């Protein structure tokens, strides 16, 4: 019952770059890259990546590849008191697989509802109000009103979401059966992809993680061909250095690069804990980050050449064109542009196919992380029957995601999106980094990497893991630890108890860390000093 190695080196190099690009690089990077300057954002993206996302990535990979013991059981080899990080990251994975598969369910609904020769985004039919309809730009007259909504917006907020039947978080009764049986298929695909561990979760990536690129190439070609591409690409690449002065651009760049590379979420550890010992853990940790960045860049080109075509057709500049959140920016304006493209009913099928494929492998990885962690944590009650407990984690994530699929829908999805990824996950990552760096002496963390690869890490990573990463994580924590949450999606002001609910959701994490710290300090005997010194050092039997 040894660690099942990957099929090939590319079998893991592709899995990690499939896990990297999930949804930020496809909708949030351009939306966050035009609000913050446009050209003055790529520099605080690169000089923030190289300082806070790539070193953490390489540290996670090297740690998982040397220790080869998962995420929750590696702490008994790093720092005993910090074993609560595993339970915290399991709770985090529960919340995030709860709020994350709803977007894939919406994408699958759009896919299965786009087979009609005429896409249901150009006309204005029963479930799509006409009193506020007609805002689609495919009209000769210049009639416009600040209350009019495009037919794609009504399709997104009245057919798939049915958000008109929910006045907010105060009442969200009624479950969308057409989505309830739509997310069940996605969870079935997830379970049948990670029902054997890695021997199939790697082979599925050979088609789930490289297919988004094959679709992005043709979509980029079609967007550049569009009449009005340059009017959008210029705005995408137009620098506004007066925006770089404000710290908002730096905060947004740090948050985006961290939550796009995703280091320390207990998944890179579980992945590196599978490949061989002498594998090159540097040439795959240095290529994944640049591949993710290039993917975000190309997808930004795609999204904004489409937005430039739309703005040039609507006889209005790129501003005041679909200024809302990410999922709206991908399901309303881009859907309308696809419905108005010449060869319709084909640029929607492949678009939603790529949109669901670059989320499927990401969720595969996010669940496989905690699966491997809990598996190699208890190798007696588990690790003999892996066919089970994957059904268990899938049913748990599904029953948790049954609240985001009600008629409320986005009203809970936005909350769990901007509350379950706040200072809880970042505090978990900061504690992980300070445990691997400060507590666990980095001298040993360099000796083991040298004996594993063949050369010690350079002076660049040696100074970063101790001074830059634990500082650029403390900064990214204290940044929006004081910012007022003002979610306000679909002109719906959230109540004040929503803030307390978000605080409690954040407290659901980072409570396991002190819980286990106390539970471990009480058991060990002696005075306080020896009680500390005992459970700081690894076991090393």
């Amino acid at each position, epitope marked *: 019952g040894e660690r099942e190695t990957w099929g090939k080196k590319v079998d893991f190099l592709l899995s990690v770059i499939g896990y990297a690009v999930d949804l930020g690089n496809v909708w949030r990077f351009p939306y966050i890259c035009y609000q913050n300057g446009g050209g003055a954002f790529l520099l605080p993206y690169t000089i923030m990546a190289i300082f806070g996302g790539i070193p953490l990535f390489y540290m996670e990979l090297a740690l998982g590849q040397y220790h080869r013991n998962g995420c929750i059981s590696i702490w008994r080899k790093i720092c005993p008191i910090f074993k609560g990080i595993g339970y915290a990251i399991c709770i985090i994975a529960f919340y995030i697989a709860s709020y994350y598969n709803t977007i894939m369910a919406w994408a699958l609904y759009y896919l299965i509802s786009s087979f009609t020769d005429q896409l249901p985004w150009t*006309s204005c039919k029963n479930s799509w109000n006409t009193g506020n309809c*007609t805002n689609y730009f495919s009209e000769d007259n210049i009639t416009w009103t600040l209350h009019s909504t495009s037919p794609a917006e009504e399709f997104y907020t009245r057919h798939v979401l049915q958000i*008109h039947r929910s006045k907010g978080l105060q009442d969200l009764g009624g479950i969308s059966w057409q989505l309830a049986l739509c997310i069940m298929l996605i969870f079935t695909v997830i379970y049948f992809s990670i029902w054997k561990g890695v021997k199939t979760s790697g082979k599925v990536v050979w088609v789930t993680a490289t297919f988004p690129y094959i679709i992005l190439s043709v979509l980029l070609v079609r967007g550049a061909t569009l009449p009005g591409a340059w009017r959008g690409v210029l705005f995408y690449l137009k620098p506004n250095w007066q925006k770089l002065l404000e710290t908002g651009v730096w905060i947004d760049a740090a948050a985006q690069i961290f939550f796009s590379l995703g280091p320390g979420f207990g998944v890179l550890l579980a992945f590196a804990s599978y490949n061989k010992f002498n594998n090159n853990c540097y040439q795959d940790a240095l290529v994944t980050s640049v591949v993710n960045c290039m993917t975000s860049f190309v997808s930004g080109f795609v999204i904004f050449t489409v937005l430039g075509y739309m703005a040039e057709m609507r006889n209005e500049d790129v501003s005041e064109v679909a200024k809302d959140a990410g999922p709206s920016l991908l399901f309303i304006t881009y859907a309308e542009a696809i419905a108005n493209m010449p060869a319709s009913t084909f640029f929607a099928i492949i678009f939603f196919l790529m949109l669901i494929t670059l989320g499927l492998d990401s969720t595969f990885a996010g669940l496989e992380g905690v699966i491997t962690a809990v598996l190699d944590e208890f190798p007696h009650v588990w690790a003999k029957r892996r066919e089970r407990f994957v059904l268990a984690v899938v049913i748990t994530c599904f029953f948790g995601s049954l609240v985001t699929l009600t008629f409320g829908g986005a009203y809970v999805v936005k909350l769990l999106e901007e509350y379950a990824t706040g200072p809880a996950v970042l505090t978990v990552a900061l504690i992980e980094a300070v445990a691997v760096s400060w507590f666990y002496g980095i001298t040993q963390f360099c000796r083991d990497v040298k004996e594993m690869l063949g050369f010690s890490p350079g002076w660049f990573w040696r100074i970063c893991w101790v001074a830059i990463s634990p500082l650029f994580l403390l900064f990214i924590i204290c940044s929006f630890l004081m910012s007022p949450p003002q979610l306000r999606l679909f002109q719906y002001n959230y109540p004040y108890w929503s803030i307390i609910l978000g605080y409690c959701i954040g407290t659901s994490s980072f409570i396991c860390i002190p819980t286990y710290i106390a539970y471990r300090l009480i058991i060990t005997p002696g005075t306080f000093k020896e009680r500390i010194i005992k459970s700081i050092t690894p076991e090393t039997p």
Partner: antibody
Amino acid sequence: QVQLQQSGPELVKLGASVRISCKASGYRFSYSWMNWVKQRPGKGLEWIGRIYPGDGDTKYSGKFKGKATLTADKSSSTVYMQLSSLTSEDSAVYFCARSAYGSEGFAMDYWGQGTSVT
Amino acid sequence: DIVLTQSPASLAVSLGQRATISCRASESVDNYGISFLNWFQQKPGQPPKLLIYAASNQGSGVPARFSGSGSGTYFSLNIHPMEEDDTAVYFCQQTKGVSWTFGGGTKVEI
């Protein structure tokens, strides 16, 4: 205000064809349906067909698709329905109902005068 | 094609009683929350003026006598006690796709 107008009455001939017109004004007619009903003398209303000026989406019911082909002329703010094979049963009035927005439940708010054929 | 059964097809109600008009169907025409159905009134020699949106919401320029209730399959028109001016035929025109249908009409009089 919203008001609709139609043509005058015609004569029912065996196998002949008649073109019932229906105007529209006071609203953006390129986004509201233009229904058609047949209220035979003595009996209740009967739905003939449907049209959506701006997309050409037409619906029918019960062979009315081969007997009444609807046509929308978005230029003169008029909708047509070219009847054919006028059987003695087709000697009735032909209202031109305007279906409202979809959120209201497709309400046939405003109705034409009625182009009775005998 | 949906069947719209109406009953009673004739209400011999006088001035001062709340008459009722039922309207059943196979569906389950409740769609997207707004129950797709309407209620009309065809006075002798007049176009069918509309009464109720979605079997619950009032029309335009109509007194509050003609109420509305029901959801799913059973839709009812509980008209307030009226006088002899509202003697006409009332239809139950659903709007759930794809082909709409009209009821049989329930003429009312004293």
